[PDB]
C-alpha cells in the first residue's frame, strides 16, 4: 500500500459506465422520484426475493471455500441477513404490499433472474474463494451507489412508500457489508497475477451487466 | 404411460419448432445465411462447447457407477476431439489467436452457467437432463434441414447438416436419452417436474443462442 | 406411514454395534465416570473445534443444495450454532481449559480428523441434498445416545467439570436438532430406490466408523 | 531458489523412503509378496482409481484454459482405458462381479475423499497438487524396485514394475510436475505452504494404503 494497484478500484472503474446506466434507468429513477408504478415494484420485490434465495447459496459457497474461521463467520452472517432477518428491507415490503407466503412459494424466476444467479453460482463453483468474493460484489456495491445517488432528489428519503428502500441500502450497516466484501477481495488478491485479475474483472463486469438487465426486466414486468 | 424423455420432448417441441424455423437455422438449410453470421456463430459455439464439456466432467464426478463414468468421459473426448468446428475453422480463416481472445456473449455464458449450476446443485439426474436439449434439438434441427432439398449438397453448409444428422451423432443423443430414462424410473412426480423445468429452460437458451448468433 | 420402511430406523439399526463400541470406549466412559485425564480432554476439544469448522462446511453444502427456503434456513441456523454461538458446548470448555485463540489458530487436525471431514464433504459434493443429510446425521445422533447413556452412572450430570458436556448433548434443544436431521432424511427419501438407500446406509456406517476412530485418536492423544 | 514441485518432493522424500522399504513394496521387488495380498491390493486399487479419475474430472471443470482441460480429460481416459489392473484381473481370476461387489477400505475412502474435498474447496492449483503424490511416488518406487535384480524378469511381478517405470508413465508424471510448476509461479508463501500440506497428507495416505494392502 498505497503506490500499489488496488484491484477493487480497478473493478470499480471498469463498472462505472454500467452502474451509471443503472442509476438513470426508468425503474431506478422511478424509485428516486416516487413515480414508479406500484405493481411494477411488487413484481420486482417478488423477483428479488427469489434472487436473494439463490444469492444466499453463493455466500454458502463462501463458507465452504473460506479457509479462515473469521471469514467463514462473515459469510455465515451474510446468509442469516437474507434468511433470518424479519428486519430486512424485503420483509418490510412483503407486508406493505401484503404479499402472501403462498404467492412467494408459487412464483417463478424470470430468465434474467435465473441467468444471473446461475452465473454467480457456476463461477463460485469453478473457482476459489477469490471468485466467490468477486461474484457477489457488484450486487451490494451497485445498490449502495444507486441508493447514495437517489438519497438526494430531494424528498426521496422522506417518501412515505419508497423512502424505506433508499434509506435501507444507504445505511451505515449496509455500507459496512459492502466494505467487508471490498476488503475481503483486496486481501485475497495481493499476490494475484495479471491473468487472474482479468478473470475477476470479467466476473465483476458480467454481474454488473446482469444487474442492468435485472432492472430492465423488473420494469418490463 | 410415457418415458420421462418423451415427456420432456413433448413439453419442448414448441420451442424446437421456433428454433427450426429461425432465420439463422433456415438460413443454413437454404444457403441464405451470410458467411459472416455463421463465422460469428462458430466462434461462439466453440466457446460454448468448452463450458459444455465441463458439465460432462461434472457427470464423471457424480456418476456412481463405472459404466456411466466411462460414458461421460468419452463424451468429453468426443466434444473436444475431426470435429465440425475444426472443418469450419479451416474453411473460414479463424486463427488460434482469434479463438483464444474471443469473448462469449451474455446469452452464451447464461446458458452454460445454468447447466453447470443445476448440475452442481443436484445429482446425476439433473446433469443428464441439463445436457440433453442441446444434443437432441440439434439432431431434430439437422433432420429437418436435411429434406429441403439441395441442403446436403451445398458446398459450404452441407457439412454442418451432414454432421448433426449422422449415425454417430444420433447414437450420442440416444445414449443421453436412454441414460436419463434409466436414471429416473424411481423418480417422484415432483422430481420429474424439476427435470422438465431444466429441460425447457435449456431449450429457451438454445433459442436465445440462435437469436444471439443471428444478431452477431 | 407406518407399515412402510423408515430409512432412518434402517440406518440406526445398522449403526448400533458401532455406537455401542463408542459408548463403552475408554474416552467416553472416562467422561461418564469423571476419570478421563484432563489433558486428554483438552486435546479432544481442540481437535473437535477444528472438526466443527469443517462440519459447518458440510451444512453450507446443505444451503446450496436445498431447494426449499425452510430447509435452507434450517441449514443456515446449524452453521450459526457452530460459528456464532458463545453459549455452545465448545466455547464453554475453551474458557474452562483457558485455551488461547492463538493455540486454536496454530492447531493441526490429525489424520483421523481430516479423513472424516473430507469424507462428509466429498460425499456431499458428489451427491445431492440426500447425501448431505445422511453424511451429517451420525455425528449428532451418536452424540445424543452417548449422552443419554452417560446421563445415568450416576453423578455424571452433577460432575463439576464433565457435567456440562453430558447435559449439553442430552438437552431438549440438541434433541430437536437431531430430530430435525432425522425428519429431513426421512422426508427426502420417500421415493428412493433400494440402490439409493444402500448408498445412504454406506455413508451413515462409514461416518459411524470415523466417529469411533475419532474417540480413539482423542484417547491416544 | 527452487521449483515448488522440488520443494514438495523434498518434504515428502522421507515418507516415500518408508514406502519403498515397506514389506508389501519390497515384496513386489523381490517376489516374496503372497499372491493373495497382491490380489486384495489390486481390487482396492481398482476402486481407488475410479475415485481418483473423478479428481481429474474436477480438473476439467476448474481448468480455465483449453490446453489443460484437454490434458485432464486425457488423464481420465488413460486412468480408465491395456491397463496394468486388467492384466492382473486376467492373470488372477477376478470376475467383473467380484469388482462390482467390492468395498473400499477406510484407508482407501479417506485418501480419495481427501483429494476430492481439497480439489473442491480450492482452485486448479490444489487439484494439481492433490493428484501428484500418487503418480510421482509410484514412479520412484518402480524405479527403485527396477534394480534389485531379477525384479523385472519375475514371471508375475515384472509387469507391474515395468508398467510404473515406463517412458509413458514417466511422461504422465512429468506433465503433472510441469503443470503444478507453471500454475504456481505467482503463488504467495502461504499458498505454497498450503500445497505442501496437501502433498504430504497424500503421501501419508499412500503409506497407509500400502499398509492396508499388506493387512488384507
From Swiss-Prot, chains B, D:
It holds the Pfam family TENA_THI-4. It comes from Helicobacter pylori. One of its GO terms (cellular component) is cytosol. Homotetramer. This is Aminopyrimidine aminohydrolase. One of its GO terms (molecular function) is thiaminase activity. Catalyzes an amino-pyrimidine hydrolysis reaction at the C5' of the pyrimidine moiety of thiamine compounds to give a hydroxymethylpyrimidine (HMP). Displays low activity on 4-amino-5-aminomethyl-2-methylpyrimidine as substrate, indicating that the enzyme may act on a different HMP precursor that may derive from the human stomach food assumption or processing. Is probably involved in thiamine biosynthesis. Does not display thiaminase II activity, as it is unable to hydrolyze thiamine. H.pylori is expected to possess a reduced thiamine biosynthetic pathway. Some enzymes involved in de novo thiamine biosynthesis in other organisms, such as ThiO, ThiS and ThiG, are missing in this species. The very acidic environment of the stomach makes the accumulation of formylaminopyrimidine very unlikely because it is mainly a base-degraded derivative of thiamine; formylaminopyrimidine is the precursor identified in a thiamine salvage pathway in Bacillus species. Belongs to the TenA family. SUPFAM superfamilies: Heme oxygenase-like. PANTHER family: BIFUNCTIONAL TH2 PROTEIN, SI:CH1073-67J19.1-RELATED.
